[PDB]
Amino acid sequence: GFEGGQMPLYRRLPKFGFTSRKAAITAEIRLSDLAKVEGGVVDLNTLK
Amino acid sequence: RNGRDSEAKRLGVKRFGGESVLAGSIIVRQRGTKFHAGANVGCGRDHTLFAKADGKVKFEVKGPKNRKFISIEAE
């Protein structure tokens, strides 16, 4: 990231946003995953 | 006591006669109306002439003052 002493790109641009703790404990399930569970009922525990 | 100058402004003609342009395209950047806006050409706040329609650039000398107008001939 050193540019010869010019204020580098990752410092001349502003920070933004925050990180969500909820996003880390949220998943997406594809339709192709629904058959992969045992016994035809899809909930968190059967997906796990 | 000298040694100063300003940045060059890249003025002048961007699209010459007969060039096909899209609407919005800048035709000339200038200081004041060295060229004037003809048919299908707008004049911006800094005297930039730009195409208001798709077509070909046309320079022409018209009026009693014999002024250089720029128009777009629609395709």
Partner: protein, 64 residues
């Protein structure tokens, strides 16, 4: 050992679907009264990192 992320870069860039990076525009922190609304409006949405700069950003964010 594992490469360390440049943590300042991770706070300023996010990787997009085709592997580019989005960033927030400069010039919208302060000294805002003198700036035209048009100029500020155009600085609000996030922008993509340019081709010249991608190499620098990628080096800083090896786990992007």
């Amino acid at each position: 050992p594992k490469i360390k992320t440049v943590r300042g870069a991770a706070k300023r860039f996010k990787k997009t679907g085709k592997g580019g990076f989005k960033h927030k525009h400069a010039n919208l922190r302060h000294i805002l009264t003198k700036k035209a609304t048009k100029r500020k409006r155009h600085l609000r949405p996030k922008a993509m990192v340019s081709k010249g700069d991608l190499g620098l950003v990628i080096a800083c964010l090896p786990y992007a």
